[PDB]
Amino acid sequence: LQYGPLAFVLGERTTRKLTETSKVITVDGNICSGKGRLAREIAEKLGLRHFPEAGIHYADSTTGDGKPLDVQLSGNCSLEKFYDDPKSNDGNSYRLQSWLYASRLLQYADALEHLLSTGQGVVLERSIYSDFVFLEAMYRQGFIRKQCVEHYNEVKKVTACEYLPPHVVVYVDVPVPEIQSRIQKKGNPHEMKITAAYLQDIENAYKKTFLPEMSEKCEVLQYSAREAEDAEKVVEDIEYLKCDKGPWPDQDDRTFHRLRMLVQNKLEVLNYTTIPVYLPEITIGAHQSDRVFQKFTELPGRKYSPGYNEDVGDKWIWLK
Amino acid sequence: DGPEKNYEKTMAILQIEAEKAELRLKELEVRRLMRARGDGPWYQYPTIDKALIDHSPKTTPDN
Amino acid sequence: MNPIIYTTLIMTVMSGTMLVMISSHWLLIWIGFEMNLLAMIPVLMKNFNPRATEAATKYFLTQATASMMLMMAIIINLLYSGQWTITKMFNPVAMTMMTMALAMKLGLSPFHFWVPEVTQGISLQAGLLLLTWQKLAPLSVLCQISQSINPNLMLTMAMLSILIGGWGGLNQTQLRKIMAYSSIAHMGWMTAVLPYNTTMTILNLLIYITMTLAMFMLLIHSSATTTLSLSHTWNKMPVITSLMMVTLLSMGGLPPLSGFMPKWMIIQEMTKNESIIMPTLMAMTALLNLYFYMRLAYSSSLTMFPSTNNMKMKWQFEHTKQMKLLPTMIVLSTLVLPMTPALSSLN
Amino acid sequence: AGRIASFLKNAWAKEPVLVASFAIGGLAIILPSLSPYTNYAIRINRATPYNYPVPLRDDGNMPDVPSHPQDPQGPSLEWLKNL
Amino acid sequence: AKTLLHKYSDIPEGTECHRKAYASTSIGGATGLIVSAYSIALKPPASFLEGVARTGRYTFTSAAIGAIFGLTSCISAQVREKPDDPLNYFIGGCAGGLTLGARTRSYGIGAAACAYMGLTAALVKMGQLEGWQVFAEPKV
Amino acid sequence: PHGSPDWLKVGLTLGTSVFLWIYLIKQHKEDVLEYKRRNGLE
Amino acid sequence: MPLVYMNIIMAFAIALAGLLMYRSHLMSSLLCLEGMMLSLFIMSTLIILNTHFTLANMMPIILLVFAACEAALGLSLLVMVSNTYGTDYVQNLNLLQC
Amino acid sequence: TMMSGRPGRVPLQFLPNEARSLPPPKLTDPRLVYMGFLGYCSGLIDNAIRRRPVVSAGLHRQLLYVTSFVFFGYYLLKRQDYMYALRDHDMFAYVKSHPEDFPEKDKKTYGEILEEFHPVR
Ligand SMILES: CCCCCCCCCCCCCCCCC[C@@H](O)O[C@H](CO[C@H](O)CCCCCCCCCCCCCCC)COP(=O)(O)OCC[N+](C)(C)C
Ligand SMILES: CCCCCCCC/C=C\CCCCCCCC(=O)O[C@H](COC(=O)CCCCCCC/C=C/CCCCCCCC)COP(=O)(O)OCCN
Ligand SMILES: Nc1ncnc2c1ncn2[C@@H]1O[C@H](COP(=O)(O)OP(=O)(O)O)[C@@H](O)[C@H]1O
């Protein structure tokens, strides 16, 4: 019995499962920061569930086998090519940005579904909120055009007007020279090509816009590089603050039921990520779409429904 | 087969179609007359049932 | 809203329609219309937004005016003959006013202006319910008094409705407005045969309801509202586009598909009453409906429009909710021509 | 049994008005079907003459219909007088 | 109502040209008034004066078309000495279309109106001769 | 998802189909017997 | 048909024309609807009382009840419109168009 | 035709008692086979929409579709045949009861009938 209006009618009330410990938390930081390490510690200490940052092949992990598919069949973009050629002629920058934003939207929907179904809270890296800072960095550096940010804004507003912002925002602050040194120490051959201006734009786009917007409606915990190492103080700060300004207290059983119906059925979640606006960076010709879709169908467990694949090994096909 | 098969099959088919045509004409005429007059089972629009009338003294002699 | 409240409101709408259909008193019929209107409004406003509110208020104003006109007609009929039973109207003015009231309720032209806007403002689910279920009470009332309706008024209103639907469907791009104009044209077709044979009216109503239910369920399945959103569908579920194109061809009156059964039959009936010019005019007018259906089919299935990159992610997820009776609706709206004589069941 | 009594005791505190209203409503719903006087009320309503009693035409086969109001035949209102 | 149609139909086709012209002018004026009222209701241009100008021009155009059609048809019927001939109605319809084009001042509308109005008038005359029914009564 | 053949639904569907077919056969037999009785054929 | 019935139907027609004129102020439209309803109530009451149709005396009351309910419904919608626009002018409802 | 007001009609009976006086349709009726075909088409379309192996996804579901369609088709055919029998019975009874309106045509032979001949040249 999957969740539905009937289950809500009989027994399924999601306001009972919330026990003041849910507290959906997003840990946001600058490129190559210690936030990932910090997020893991918070989830371990508070008993929540940690969601690793959504990448190019995040959606491939949740459908069928967790093994990622080919780059052509999932994303059609690469981060290394963006680092090597930020001003690539074939519009790789926007395609990467949109695929990452939609992956983050899917991850947020999955996290909300888990929270509402189980009651155990979640910890996230950069969410759909704060993802616009990378777009601003790309635009100011000149990587993408203005129509690009207009389309991104349209998609973002349409998709995000239906989700609850996170309870707590945790920000790790690292100065630009320090993270440049960290990048040099990292050793990834593509990452030292990141210009200092790009990181400065990311940081000041974080500080000037995202932080006040989260502050006016949520709780903000700005942490420096040193003081973020001690997770005990972070957890104590998380417990001490009380959430009374966001929409979460105003939600009831009916609104929670509507949100739980929305977060599952991922097609509606991703419905507006493919609005019919034809930018050259994201649009695909008919022949290319046909060929790629045909190649996708030939994958082992993708021709039919999940339970109706003979080659994978599903049996009793003629009676399901 | 022989020609008699087709001959008699055609004769039977012709009889069937001629009967059907005559029946269709008769049906059209019957429908027209029945709607014009209203004395047949078809086109009998409902009227007020007379079993609803109360036949009792009505506190006034002149009904 | 709460699922229990939504179910209760739907039951109340159906109960109002049933009360209209099963009652023999004018006052009870008016009560059924009022109950239907009262419970139908929140269904339009299930997804709260300014467009839904404006559509709901337009619908309320139109329905309230129609109900008041209907009550005035009932009052005049009672005045000139002390009868409450729904039968011969016994008065020309009362019949004319009741015909206008039922035209307002149905959406026949020139009272058709509210249908496209109400359909556009409200959601697909609300629109589907409004387009098919609402027609049952006014059509039943019109069938019950078909022996008194003036042929001139009904025939001219039906002709105007067909013309207006055909002309207005050409311009629209949003699918909901196309469906509204399609409904207007189909009702113009269906009410033209009321004075002659109500069985043809019921048969056309059933066929139209099946076709529009199938098309709305297909539109809900592939969540598309504008034409381009529908053009994007072929990249994910080509079967849906193919079935939608077949249903669109059926809805245009193309034989041997099911949508040809009503028109043909209707024409036959009007030929029995020596009415020749009008069926020809309505056929040449339905050619316009066929044209914009064909344009939609060209946009949707017969050609492959450019896609979008993010659509790749939609390839990995399946439709979680499946609506039952969609295959049955498609089959009934496409391949039931050979069983045409079953209309003798007085359906 | 114990839970119902505990709930009634809880409701009788901090909410007496609702308990009294529900008790009175339930009593008003239930009692008339048990009272033996309701048939008496129906009979009293039936016995009130609002319209003129139109006499029947005699045909010689009406022994139960009195020929005069004083005659013993016909319904009697002694039960009402005794009430 | 139907009184104007009765006035037009009572006159014999081959006589009383002026009365036929007056009846056709009345019918055209009524149609022009109706279409002007609909245009005013659906599209209020700017004010009262523009509205009265628009209704006046529409009514005058329709009345002129009707008067020309009636006059030309009756004159052709008398001159040809052959009544009940749809050719006279065709000439009347084309003349009415020609005046419509002159009023709109473009040759394309004039020619199209001549063709599609002569055809309609001829069809109306044929229906009147053969008793074609537009709104047929429910026989069966 | 990870779904086995739901034997309850399969059993219900088979039972419904078999019951409907048996009922149809019995109804047809009774109808033909009643028609032959009424028309006095057998 | 006496002059009282003629005057009542004239009042109903005048109220209908006022409803269909639509200058502004949707509240005026609701007022016109309820004037039409009041005319209906008066006419029905006169007709029913004149002919001594006793069992039909129920009809006006019932009518009134239902109509009043509709009025309430209408008012609710009006309120929402204002809450979206700040005022109840009719010309503000132009988002949806043919 | 408007047999709705036909006297002695039960308001909500699918099949009146007198309809038992007619031969029931054979189980191998072509129309019943067509209803079975419609059911099979519905089953195939249901398999196609759900993204399942179209021919052999659910055999029980396809069987149920076919059986339901055949059931409804059988009963619908019975009702249709009864209604047509009623129409013919009313037609014949009315034509018998009104001999004046349906006079016997004076039978004529082609020998004594003059039909105009239009040559084709
Ligand atoms: C696509 C075509 C439409 C299909 C519609 C859906 C099919 C499924 C419906 C399931 C059965 C319908 C009715 C259920 C049976 C019990 C109800 C029964 O008692 O009703 C009787 C009546 O039965 C129904 O009317 C017949 C229903 C059959 C509809 C199918 C006819 C479609 C003809 C063309 C398509 C051929 C069939 C295609 C496959 C279904 C009573 O008639 P009556 O109260 O005395 O007269 C009322 C009508 N009046 C007022 C006008 C006189
Ligand atoms: C079947 C009979 C029904 C008809 C009779 C009654 C008609 C009119 C009375 C009812 C009117 C409407 C009642 C609405 C009920 C709302 C319940 C509610 O939500 O109130 C709860 C509180 O109410 C409750 O506690 C639950 C119900 C209370 C008791 C209900 C009835 C208990 C049992 C009644 C029968 C008693 C046993 C019979 C004894 C017979 C004598 C020996 C919330 O309290 P608030 O006022 O909102 O908070 C303000 C303070 N911050
Ligand atoms: N919208 C985006 N555009 C470009 N790159 C992105 C985007 N989102 C995430 N990334 C990439 O994801 C990588 C991991 O982010 P980061 O947290 O800084 O490193 P780490 O996971 O080691 O802590 C980074 O190299 C970053 O560039």
Q: What is the DSSP string of D45-70?
A: HHT---S--PPPPP-S--SSS-SSTT
C85 and B CB contact within 8 Å? yes
Say if strands C307-308 and A168-173 run parallel, antiparallel, or are unpaired.
unpaired
- DSSP-based three-state secondary structure for G97: coil
Strands lying side by side in the sheet with A219-224: A49-50, A122-124, A25-29, A168-173, A219-224
A289 within 8 A of A73, measured Cβ to Cβ: no
Q: How many CB atoms lie within 10 A of CB G4?
A: 12
Cα G77 to Cα H6: distance, rounded to the nearest angstrom:
48
Cα C192 to Cα C200: distance, rounded to the nearest angstrom:
10
The neighbours of chain C, by the rule of 3 or more Cβ pairs under 8 Å, are A, B, E, G, H
H62 in any annotated domain: yes
- CB-based contacts of A227-233 (< 8 A; 24+ apart in sequence): A228/A34, A228/A35, A228/A38, A228/A172, A229/A34, A231/A38, A231/A41, A231/A42, A231/A45, A232/A45
| Domain residue ranges in chain G | 3-92
E11 alpha carbon, distance to own chain's centre: 16
- A245-to-A16, A220, A222, A242, A249 alpha-carbon distances in Å: 21, 12, 18, 9, 8
Give chain D positions within 8 Å (CB) of B57: 51, 54
- DSSP-based three-state secondary structure for E131: coil
- E83-to-A52, A268, E17, E94, E125 alpha-carbon distances in Å: 94, 72, 13, 18, 11
- DSSP-based three-state secondary structure for C320: coil
C123 within 8 A of C52, measured Cβ to Cβ: yes
The nearest CA of chain E is from the CA of B20 a distance in Å of: 19
Cα C330 to Cα C344: distance, rounded to the nearest angstrom:
23
- DSSP-based three-state secondary structure for C217: helix
The nearest CA of chain B is from the CA of E138 a distance in Å of: 9
- H3-to-A123, A155, B44, E105, F15 alpha-carbon distances in Å: 72, 60, 8, 59, 40
Q: Which residue of G has its CA nearest to C174?
A: G98
3-state secondary structure B1-63: CCHHHHHHHHHHHHHHHHHHHHHHHHHHHHHHHHHHHCCCCCCCCCCCCHHHCCCCCCCCCCC
For the CA atoms of C305, C311, C312, C313, what is the dihedral angle to 10 degrees?
A: -170
Fold of G3-92: Helix Hairpins (1.10.287)
Cα A319 to Cα A305: distance, rounded to the nearest angstrom:
14
- DSSP-based three-state secondary structure for A136: helix
Q: State if residue D21 touches ligand 2 by the CB under 6 angstroms criterion.
A: yes
Cis ω on the peptide bond leading into residue D36 (within 30° of 0)?
no
Q: State if residue A36 touches ligand 3 by the CB under 6 angstroms criterion.
A: yes
Cross-strand bridge partners of residue A147 = none
Cα of A121 vs centre of ligand 3, distance in Å, is 24
The nearest CA of chain H is from the CA of B35 a distance in Å of: 8
Q: Which residue of C has its CA nearest to A64?
A: C316
Cα A176 to Cα C195: distance, rounded to the nearest angstrom:
84
Instruction: Say whether the D–E interface has 3 or more Cβ pairs within 8 Å.
Output: no
Q: State if residue H12 touches ligand 1 by the CB under 6 angstroms criterion.
A: yes
A61 within 8 A of A68, measured Cβ to Cβ: yes
Cα C125 to Cα C223: distance, rounded to the nearest angstrom:
11
- The Cα angle at residue E51 between residues E49 and E55, in degrees rounded to 5: 120
- CB-based contacts of B2-7 (< 8 A; 24+ apart in sequence): none
H86 in any annotated domain: yes
H111 in any annotated domain: no
Residue type, C285: T
Resolution (A): 3.3
H64 in any annotated domain: yes
- DSSP-based three-state secondary structure for C307: strand
H33 in any annotated domain: yes
Q: Is the dihedral of CA A63, A64, A67, A68 positive or negative?
A: negative
Q: List CB contacts of A170: < 8 A, sequence separation 6 or more.
A: A25, A26, A27, A28, A35, A38, A39, A42, A221, A223, A234
G96–C120: do the CB atoms touch at under 8 Å? Answer: yes
Half-sphere exposure of A153 (CA within 13 A, CB side): 8
C197 within 8 A of C204, measured Cβ to Cβ: no
Cα C253 to Cα C186: distance, rounded to the nearest angstrom:
11
- How many helices (H) does chain H have, and how many strands (E)? 2, 0
Cα A26 to Cα A112: distance, rounded to the nearest angstrom:
12
G9 within 8 A of C79, measured Cβ to Cβ: no
Structural domain that includes position H43:
1-98
Cis ω on the peptide bond leading into residue C110 (within 30° of 0)?
yes
Name the residue among C135, C36, C154 with its Cα closest to residue C95. C154
- Token digits for A192? 């030292």
Closest-approaching ligand to the CA atom of H15: 1
Cα A276 to Cα A158: distance, rounded to the nearest angstrom:
13
Cα B23 to Cα B3: distance, rounded to the nearest angstrom:
30
A166 within 8 A of A111, measured Cβ to Cβ: no
H30 in any annotated domain: yes
E134 and C CB contact within 8 Å? yes
Q: Which residue has the tokens 């120490």?
A: A185
Cα A262 to Cα B56: distance, rounded to the nearest angstrom:
68
Name the residue among C267, C99, C271, C251 with its Cα closest to residue C166. C251
A42 within 8 A of A238, measured Cβ to Cβ: yes
**CB contact burial H21-43 (16+ within 10 A = b; e otherwise):** ebebbeeeeebbebbbebbbbbb
- The Cα angle at residue A88 between residues A84 and A91, in degrees rounded to 5: 130
Cα C274 to Cα E133: distance, rounded to the nearest angstrom:
7
- Token digits for A86? 């930020």
In degrees and rounded to multiples of 5, residue A173 shows phi and psi of -100, 125
Cα C58 to Cα C122: distance, rounded to the nearest angstrom:
11
Provide DSSP, C61-81. Answer: HHHHHHHHHHHHHHHHHHHHS
C273–E139: do the CB atoms touch at under 8 Å? Answer: yes
Name the residue among C273, C105, C263 with its Cα closest to residue C195. C273
- Token digits for C242? 């193919």
Half-sphere exposure of H9 (CA within 13 A, CB side): 15
Cα of C345 vs centre of ligand 1, distance in Å, is 7
Q: From the CA of H10, give the closest atom in ligand 1.
A: 45
Closest-approaching ligand to the CA atom of C205: 1
Cross-strand bridge partners of residue A222 = A171
The answer to whether the annotation marks A125 as part of a ligand binding site is: yes
Cα H101 to Cα H82: distance, rounded to the nearest angstrom:
27
Closest-approaching ligand to the CA atom of D9: 2
D57 and B CB contact within 8 Å? no
What is the count of structural domains for chain H?
A: 1
- Token digits for A316? 């009793």
H52 in any annotated domain: yes
